[model samples]
Target chain A: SNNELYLELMKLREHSDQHVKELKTSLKKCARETADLKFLNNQYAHKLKLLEKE
Target chain B: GSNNELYLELMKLREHSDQHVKELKTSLKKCARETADLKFLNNQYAHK
Candidate 1:
Protein backbone atom coordinates (compact mmCIF):
# COMPACT_ATOMS: atom_id res chain seq x y z
CA SER A 1 0.00 0.00 0.00
CA ASN A 2 1.45 3.33 -1.08
CA ASN A 3 -0.43 5.09 1.68
CA GLU A 4 0.95 2.67 4.26
CA LEU A 5 4.46 3.28 3.01
CA TYR A 6 4.01 7.02 3.39
CA LEU A 7 2.74 6.57 6.91
CA GLU A 8 5.75 4.42 7.72
CA LEU A 9 8.07 7.06 6.36
CA MET A 10 6.58 9.57 8.76
CA LYS A 11 7.09 7.21 11.70
CA LEU A 12 10.64 6.49 10.64
CA ARG A 13 11.49 10.15 10.49
CA GLU A 14 10.08 10.73 13.94
CA HIS A 15 12.03 7.80 15.36
CA SER A 16 15.25 8.85 13.69
CA ASP A 17 15.04 12.38 14.98
CA GLN A 18 14.28 11.23 18.49
CA HIS A 19 17.28 8.89 18.64
CA VAL A 20 19.76 11.40 17.25
CA LYS A 21 18.47 14.08 19.58
CA GLU A 22 18.74 11.86 22.65
CA LEU A 23 22.26 10.80 21.69
CA LYS A 24 23.34 14.38 21.12
CA THR A 25 22.15 15.26 24.58
CA SER A 26 24.08 12.40 26.18
CA LEU A 27 27.23 13.16 24.21
CA LYS A 28 26.94 16.83 25.17
CA LYS A 29 27.38 15.89 28.84
CA CYS A 30 30.94 14.66 28.55
CA ALA A 31 31.51 16.63 25.36
CA ARG A 32 33.30 19.04 27.65
CA GLU A 33 35.69 16.32 28.77
CA THR A 34 38.18 18.06 26.57
CA ALA A 35 38.05 21.03 28.88
CA ASP A 36 38.02 18.86 31.97
CA LEU A 37 41.08 16.93 30.83
CA LYS A 38 42.88 20.13 30.00
CA PHE A 39 42.20 21.40 33.49
CA LEU A 40 43.57 18.13 34.89
CA ASN A 41 47.13 19.39 34.43
CA ASN A 42 49.19 22.57 34.92
CA GLN A 43 46.15 24.50 33.68
CA TYR A 44 44.62 23.69 37.05
CA ALA A 45 41.02 22.42 36.84
CA HIS A 46 38.54 25.07 35.73
CA LYS A 47 35.36 23.28 36.66
CA LEU A 48 34.15 24.35 40.10
CA LYS A 49 33.23 20.82 41.10
CA LEU A 50 36.53 19.42 39.86
CA LEU A 51 38.34 21.82 42.15
CA GLU A 52 39.26 20.71 45.65
CA LYS A 53 37.36 23.55 47.31
CA GLU A 54 39.26 26.72 46.34
CA GLY B 1 -0.57 5.75 -6.78
CA SER B 2 1.92 3.09 -5.58
CA ASN B 3 5.62 3.87 -5.89
CA ASN B 4 8.95 2.04 -5.78
CA GLU B 5 10.95 5.22 -5.46
CA LEU B 6 9.39 6.08 -2.15
CA TYR B 7 9.85 2.58 -0.79
CA LEU B 8 13.43 2.47 -2.00
CA GLU B 9 14.31 5.73 -0.29
CA LEU B 10 12.61 4.66 2.89
CA MET B 11 14.81 1.59 3.18
CA LYS B 12 17.93 3.56 2.57
CA LEU B 13 17.03 6.19 5.09
CA ARG B 14 16.27 3.60 7.75
CA GLU B 15 19.59 1.82 7.31
CA HIS B 16 21.54 5.05 7.35
CA SER B 17 19.79 6.32 10.41
CA ASP B 18 20.32 3.01 12.21
CA GLN B 19 24.01 3.11 11.52
CA HIS B 20 24.25 6.71 12.62
CA VAL B 21 22.60 5.94 15.92
CA LYS B 22 24.94 3.03 16.61
CA GLU B 23 27.99 5.15 15.89
CA LEU B 24 26.83 7.93 18.14
CA LYS B 25 26.19 5.46 20.95
CA THR B 26 29.70 4.05 20.68
CA SER B 27 31.16 7.53 20.52
CA LEU B 28 29.31 8.65 23.62
CA LYS B 29 30.49 5.57 25.51
CA LYS B 30 34.10 6.23 24.49
CA CYS B 31 33.88 9.78 25.78
CA ALA B 32 32.41 8.63 29.08
CA ARG B 33 35.07 5.95 29.44
CA GLU B 34 37.93 8.38 28.95
CA THR B 35 36.35 10.83 31.31
CA ALA B 36 36.06 8.11 33.92
CA ASP B 37 39.77 7.45 33.65
CA LEU B 38 40.55 11.13 33.97
CA LYS B 39 38.50 11.31 37.15
CA PHE B 40 40.56 8.58 38.73
CA LEU B 41 43.80 10.21 37.75
CA ASN B 42 42.59 13.58 38.90
CA ASN B 43 41.55 12.09 42.22
CA GLN B 44 45.01 10.65 42.76
CA TYR B 45 46.54 14.05 42.16
CA ALA B 46 44.07 15.59 44.57
CA HIS B 47 45.14 13.03 47.18
CA LYS B 48 48.76 14.02 46.55
Candidate 2:
Protein backbone atom coordinates (compact mmCIF):
# COMPACT_ATOMS: atom_id res chain seq x y z
CA SER A 1 0.00 0.00 0.00
CA ASN A 2 2.78 2.43 0.86
CA ASN A 3 4.60 1.69 -2.36
CA GLU A 4 1.47 2.27 -4.35
CA LEU A 5 0.94 5.54 -2.62
CA TYR A 6 4.48 6.58 -3.34
CA LEU A 7 4.09 5.75 -7.01
CA GLU A 8 0.86 7.69 -7.25
CA LEU A 9 2.39 10.62 -5.48
CA MET A 10 5.29 10.67 -7.89
CA LYS A 11 2.91 10.61 -10.81
CA LEU A 12 0.99 13.54 -9.40
CA ARG A 13 4.15 15.52 -8.86
CA GLU A 14 5.14 14.96 -12.44
CA HIS A 15 1.75 16.10 -13.61
CA SER A 16 1.93 19.25 -11.52
CA ASP A 17 5.40 20.01 -12.74
CA GLN A 18 4.20 19.76 -16.32
CA HIS A 19 1.36 22.11 -15.55
CA VAL A 20 3.75 24.63 -14.03
CA LYS A 21 5.80 24.67 -17.21
CA GLU A 22 2.74 25.20 -19.37
CA LEU A 23 1.42 27.97 -17.14
CA LYS A 24 4.74 29.75 -17.22
CA THR A 25 4.78 29.64 -21.00
CA SER A 26 1.25 30.96 -21.22
CA LEU A 27 1.94 33.73 -18.73
CA LYS A 28 5.02 34.78 -20.63
CA LYS A 29 2.99 35.11 -23.80
CA CYS A 30 0.34 37.09 -21.95
CA ALA A 31 2.96 39.45 -20.61
CA ARG A 32 4.33 40.08 -24.08
CA GLU A 33 0.83 40.65 -25.46
CA THR A 34 0.00 43.06 -22.66
CA ALA A 35 3.12 45.05 -23.35
CA ASP A 36 2.34 45.23 -27.03
CA LEU A 37 -1.23 46.34 -26.37
CA LYS A 38 -0.14 49.07 -24.02
CA PHE A 39 2.36 50.34 -26.52
CA LEU A 40 -0.28 50.38 -29.22
CA ASN A 41 -2.73 52.20 -26.96
CA ASN A 42 -0.18 54.86 -26.15
CA GLN A 43 0.55 55.34 -29.81
CA TYR A 44 -3.13 55.83 -30.49
CA ALA A 45 -3.43 58.32 -27.65
CA HIS A 46 -0.50 60.30 -29.01
CA LYS A 47 -2.02 60.33 -32.46
CA LEU A 48 -5.36 61.45 -31.04
CA LYS A 49 -3.73 64.36 -29.26
CA LEU A 50 -2.07 65.47 -32.48
CA LEU A 51 -5.37 65.20 -34.29
CA GLU A 52 -7.10 67.28 -31.64
CA LYS A 53 -4.49 70.01 -32.09
CA GLU A 54 -5.10 69.99 -35.86
CA GLY B 1 11.63 11.07 4.27
CA SER B 2 12.62 13.10 1.19
CA ASN B 3 9.77 11.99 -1.03
CA ASN B 4 7.14 13.80 0.99
CA GLU B 5 9.14 16.98 1.09
CA LEU B 6 9.72 16.98 -2.65
CA TYR B 7 6.06 16.38 -3.24
CA LEU B 8 5.06 19.30 -1.06
CA GLU B 9 7.48 21.63 -2.79
CA LEU B 10 6.20 20.57 -6.17
CA MET B 11 2.66 21.23 -5.05
CA LYS B 12 3.58 24.68 -3.86
CA LEU B 13 5.31 25.47 -7.11
CA ARG B 14 2.24 24.39 -9.02
CA GLU B 15 -0.03 26.56 -6.86
CA HIS B 16 2.16 29.58 -7.30
CA SER B 17 2.26 29.12 -11.02
CA ASP B 18 -1.53 28.81 -11.12
CA GLN B 19 -1.94 32.08 -9.25
CA HIS B 20 0.48 33.83 -11.54
CA VAL B 21 -1.50 32.64 -14.55
CA LYS B 22 -4.72 33.99 -13.07
CA GLU B 23 -3.23 37.40 -12.41
CA LEU B 24 -1.76 37.59 -15.90
CA LYS B 25 -5.11 36.66 -17.44
CA THR B 26 -6.82 39.52 -15.64
CA SER B 27 -4.10 41.90 -16.75
CA LEU B 28 -4.46 40.68 -20.31
CA LYS B 29 -8.17 41.43 -20.28
CA LYS B 30 -7.60 44.88 -18.88
CA CYS B 31 -5.05 45.63 -21.52
CA ALA B 32 -7.36 44.38 -24.23
CA ARG B 33 -10.13 46.68 -23.01
CA GLU B 34 -7.81 49.62 -22.67
CA THR B 35 -6.55 49.20 -26.20
CA ALA B 36 -10.06 48.94 -27.58
CA ASP B 37 -11.20 52.09 -25.77
CA LEU B 38 -8.16 54.02 -26.89
CA LYS B 39 -8.78 52.99 -30.49
CA PHE B 40 -12.40 54.12 -30.27
CA LEU B 41 -11.42 57.46 -28.82
CA ASN B 42 -8.74 57.94 -31.43
CA ASN B 43 -11.21 57.27 -34.18
CA GLN B 44 -13.63 59.81 -32.75
CA TYR B 45 -10.99 62.47 -32.54
CA ALA B 46 -9.72 61.73 -36.04
CA HIS B 47 -13.18 62.20 -37.48
CA LYS B 48 -13.54 65.60 -35.87
Candidate 3:
Protein backbone atom coordinates (compact mmCIF):
# COMPACT_ATOMS: atom_id res chain seq x y z
CA SER A 1 0.00 0.00 0.00
CA ASN A 2 1.09 3.56 -0.57
CA ASN A 3 0.81 4.23 3.14
CA GLU A 4 3.35 1.54 3.86
CA LEU A 5 5.57 2.89 1.16
CA TYR A 6 5.10 6.31 2.62
CA LEU A 7 6.15 5.12 6.04
CA GLU A 8 9.24 3.45 4.59
CA LEU A 9 10.15 6.50 2.57
CA MET A 10 9.76 8.76 5.57
CA LYS A 11 12.32 6.66 7.41
CA LEU A 12 14.65 6.58 4.42
CA ARG A 13 14.39 10.32 4.06
CA GLU A 14 15.34 10.77 7.69
CA HIS A 15 18.50 8.79 7.18
CA SER A 16 19.22 10.54 3.92
CA ASP A 17 18.94 13.91 5.58
CA GLN A 18 21.38 12.86 8.24
CA HIS A 19 23.77 11.52 5.61
CA VAL A 20 23.77 14.82 3.78
CA LYS A 21 24.34 16.62 7.06
CA GLU A 22 27.31 14.39 7.66
CA LEU A 23 28.74 15.33 4.31
CA LYS A 24 28.29 18.99 5.06
CA THR A 25 30.07 18.63 8.38
CA SER A 26 32.90 16.68 6.75
CA LEU A 27 33.41 19.35 4.13
CA LYS A 28 33.46 22.07 6.76
CA LYS A 29 36.10 20.24 8.73
CA CYS A 30 38.19 19.73 5.62
CA ALA A 31 38.06 23.43 4.84
CA ARG A 32 39.07 24.35 8.38
CA GLU A 33 42.07 22.06 8.20
CA THR A 34 43.08 23.56 4.90
CA ALA A 35 42.85 27.02 6.35
CA ASP A 36 45.26 26.00 9.09
CA LEU A 37 47.63 24.49 6.54
CA LYS A 38 47.68 27.71 4.56
CA PHE A 39 48.57 29.69 7.64
CA LEU A 40 51.40 27.32 8.53
CA ASN A 41 52.77 27.36 4.99
CA ASN A 42 52.85 31.11 4.98
CA GLN A 43 54.87 31.03 8.18
CA TYR A 44 57.18 28.42 6.65
CA ALA A 45 57.88 30.62 3.65
CA HIS A 46 58.60 33.54 5.90
CA LYS A 47 61.19 31.55 7.81
CA LEU A 48 62.75 30.36 4.58
CA LYS A 49 63.01 33.88 3.30
CA LEU A 50 64.74 34.91 6.53
CA LEU A 51 67.24 32.08 6.23
CA GLU A 52 67.89 32.85 2.57
CA LYS A 53 69.24 36.28 3.53
CA GLU A 54 72.27 34.52 5.11
CA GLY B 1 -0.54 12.93 0.56
CA SER B 2 2.10 10.27 -0.10
CA ASN B 3 5.90 10.29 0.23
CA ASN B 4 6.51 11.55 -3.27
CA GLU B 5 7.72 14.83 -1.90
CA LEU B 6 10.36 13.04 0.18
CA TYR B 7 11.63 11.25 -2.89
CA LEU B 8 11.92 14.57 -4.60
CA GLU B 9 13.92 15.96 -1.67
CA LEU B 10 16.17 12.94 -1.76
CA MET B 11 17.00 13.66 -5.38
CA LYS B 12 17.71 17.27 -4.56
CA LEU B 13 20.06 16.34 -1.74
CA ARG B 14 22.05 14.12 -4.05
CA GLU B 15 23.09 17.23 -5.91
CA HIS B 16 23.71 19.05 -2.64
CA SER B 17 26.04 16.32 -1.42
CA ASP B 18 28.10 16.47 -4.60
CA GLN B 19 28.20 20.22 -4.46
CA HIS B 20 29.73 20.13 -0.97
CA VAL B 21 32.46 17.81 -2.29
CA LYS B 22 33.20 20.17 -5.14
CA GLU B 23 33.65 23.03 -2.73
CA LEU B 24 35.86 20.91 -0.50
CA LYS B 25 38.16 20.11 -3.41
CA THR B 26 38.39 23.71 -4.43
CA SER B 27 39.30 24.65 -0.87
CA LEU B 28 41.97 21.97 -0.84
CA LYS B 29 43.46 23.26 -4.06
CA LYS B 30 44.26 26.54 -2.40
CA CYS B 31 46.09 24.75 0.37
CA ALA B 32 47.93 22.39 -1.98
CA ARG B 33 48.96 25.18 -4.33
CA GLU B 34 50.50 27.12 -1.48
CA THR B 35 52.45 24.08 -0.36
CA ALA B 36 53.70 23.61 -3.90
CA ASP B 37 54.82 27.21 -4.04
CA LEU B 38 56.72 26.78 -0.80
CA LYS B 39 58.29 23.57 -2.08
CA PHE B 40 59.43 25.30 -5.23
CA LEU B 41 61.24 27.79 -3.08
CA ASN B 42 62.87 24.99 -1.17
CA ASN B 43 63.95 23.34 -4.41
CA GLN B 44 65.57 26.57 -5.54
CA TYR B 45 67.39 26.91 -2.24
CA ALA B 46 68.65 23.34 -2.53
CA HIS B 47 70.11 24.05 -5.98
CA LYS B 48 71.79 27.24 -4.77
Candidate 4:
Protein backbone atom coordinates (compact mmCIF):
# COMPACT_ATOMS: atom_id res chain seq x y z
CA SER A 1 0.00 0.00 0.00
CA ASN A 2 2.86 2.38 0.72
CA ASN A 3 4.14 1.81 -2.81
CA GLU A 4 0.99 3.57 -4.03
CA LEU A 5 2.70 6.92 -3.51
CA TYR A 6 4.00 6.54 -7.05
CA LEU A 7 0.41 6.64 -8.32
CA GLU A 8 -0.48 9.67 -6.22
CA LEU A 9 2.19 11.59 -8.08
CA MET A 10 0.40 11.21 -11.38
CA LYS A 11 -2.93 11.95 -9.74
CA LEU A 12 -1.86 15.22 -8.12
CA ARG A 13 -1.29 16.59 -11.61
CA GLU A 14 -5.04 16.98 -11.93
CA HIS A 15 -4.58 19.98 -9.68
CA SER A 16 -2.43 21.87 -12.17
CA ASP A 17 -5.28 22.24 -14.63
CA GLN A 18 -7.66 22.96 -11.79
CA HIS A 19 -5.39 25.59 -10.28
CA VAL A 20 -4.93 27.32 -13.61
CA LYS A 21 -8.67 27.78 -13.85
CA GLU A 22 -8.82 28.96 -10.29
CA LEU A 23 -5.97 31.39 -10.88
CA LYS A 24 -7.83 32.91 -13.81
CA THR A 25 -10.93 33.45 -11.72
CA SER A 26 -8.88 34.97 -8.94
CA LEU A 27 -7.16 37.34 -11.35
CA LYS A 28 -10.53 38.64 -12.47
CA LYS A 29 -11.62 39.22 -8.91
CA CYS A 30 -8.35 40.94 -8.07
CA ALA A 31 -8.66 43.30 -11.01
CA ARG A 32 -12.09 44.47 -9.90
CA GLU A 33 -11.07 44.84 -6.27
CA THR A 34 -7.91 46.72 -7.22
CA ALA A 35 -9.85 49.19 -9.32
CA ASP A 36 -12.32 49.84 -6.54
CA LEU A 37 -9.58 50.27 -3.97
CA LYS A 38 -7.71 52.70 -6.18
CA PHE A 39 -10.80 54.79 -6.77
CA LEU A 40 -11.64 54.89 -3.08
CA ASN A 41 -8.08 55.76 -2.15
CA ASN A 42 -8.03 58.61 -4.63
CA GLN A 43 -11.32 59.98 -3.33
CA TYR A 44 -10.19 59.76 0.30
CA ALA A 45 -6.85 61.41 -0.44
CA HIS A 46 -8.54 64.49 -1.92
CA LYS A 47 -10.77 64.87 1.16
CA LEU A 48 -7.82 64.45 3.56
CA LYS A 49 -5.67 66.90 1.61
CA LEU A 50 -8.42 69.56 1.55
CA LEU A 51 -8.91 69.24 5.34
CA GLU A 52 -5.14 69.59 5.89
CA LYS A 53 -5.12 72.78 3.75
CA GLU A 54 -7.73 74.38 6.12
CA GLY B 1 0.46 38.41 -34.84
CA SER B 2 1.80 40.53 -32.01
CA ASN B 3 0.47 39.62 -28.61
CA ASN B 4 -1.22 36.56 -30.00
CA GLU B 5 2.10 35.22 -31.26
CA LEU B 6 3.70 36.05 -27.95
CA TYR B 7 0.96 34.18 -26.16
CA LEU B 8 1.60 31.20 -28.38
CA GLU B 9 5.28 31.34 -27.53
CA LEU B 10 4.28 31.60 -23.91
CA MET B 11 2.43 28.31 -24.19
CA LYS B 12 5.64 26.86 -25.51
CA LEU B 13 7.66 28.32 -22.66
CA ARG B 14 5.16 27.07 -20.11
CA GLU B 15 5.48 23.61 -21.60
CA HIS B 16 8.81 23.18 -19.86
CA SER B 17 7.53 24.71 -16.66
CA ASP B 18 4.50 22.45 -16.67
CA GLN B 19 6.58 19.37 -17.40
CA HIS B 20 9.05 20.32 -14.68
CA VAL B 21 6.23 20.75 -12.21
CA LYS B 22 4.96 17.29 -13.00
CA GLU B 23 8.47 15.84 -12.82
CA LEU B 24 9.14 17.41 -9.43
CA LYS B 25 5.81 16.23 -8.08
CA THR B 26 6.56 12.73 -9.29
CA SER B 27 10.07 12.88 -7.82
CA LEU B 28 8.73 14.09 -4.48
CA LYS B 29 6.39 11.15 -4.27
CA LYS B 30 9.31 8.88 -5.15
CA CYS B 31 11.41 10.47 -2.43
CA ALA B 32 8.69 9.90 0.13
CA ARG B 33 8.72 6.19 -0.57
CA GLU B 34 12.53 6.12 -0.55
CA THR B 35 12.51 7.75 2.86
CA ALA B 36 10.19 5.10 4.27
CA ASP B 37 12.34 2.32 2.81
CA LEU B 38 15.44 3.92 4.25
CA LYS B 39 13.85 4.10 7.69
CA PHE B 40 12.88 0.48 7.50
CA LEU B 41 16.42 -0.48 6.53
CA ASN B 42 17.85 1.67 9.29
CA ASN B 43 15.69 -0.09 11.86
CA GLN B 44 17.04 -3.46 10.75
CA TYR B 45 20.60 -2.12 10.77
CA ALA B 46 20.29 -0.84 14.35
CA HIS B 47 19.43 -4.36 15.57
CA LYS B 48 22.46 -5.87 13.78
TM-score of chain B of each: 0.77, 0.72, 0.67, 0.62
Q: TM-score, chain A, per candidate? A: 0.62, 0.84, 0.70, 0.67
Candidate 1 local lDDT, residue A54: 69
**Residue range A1-54, candidate 3, lDDT tens digits:** 866755665665566566656666766666666566667666766777888899
Docking class of 3: incorrect
lDDT of 1 by residue, B1-48 (tens): 247777877878876887888899999989888888777767766665
Please rank every candidate by TM-score, starting with the best.
1, 2, 3, 4
lDDT tens digits by residue: candidate 2, B1-48: 787786676566656656665666676577667667666765665564
Q: What is the lDDT of candidate 1?
A: 0.76
TM-scores of the candidates are 0.67, 0.56, 0.49, 0.42
* DockQ, candidate 2, vs. native dimer: 0.24
Candidate with top DockQ is 1
Instruction: List clashing residue pairs in candidate 1.
Output: none
> What TM-score does prediction 2 earn?
0.56
Name every residue pair that clashes in candidate 2. none
The DockQ-based CAPRI class assigned to model 2 is acceptable
Q: Write one digit per residue (lDDT tens) for candidate 1, span A1-54.
A: 678877887788679868998999889988797457747744434443456576
The candidate, 1 or 4, that scores higher on DockQ is: 1
Worst 10 residues of 1 chain B by lDDT: B39-48
DockQ of each: 0.32, 0.24, 0.20, 0.02
Task: Output the better candidate (1/3) by DockQ.
Answer: 1
Q: What TM-score results for chain B when candidate 3 is compared with the true chain B?
A: 0.67
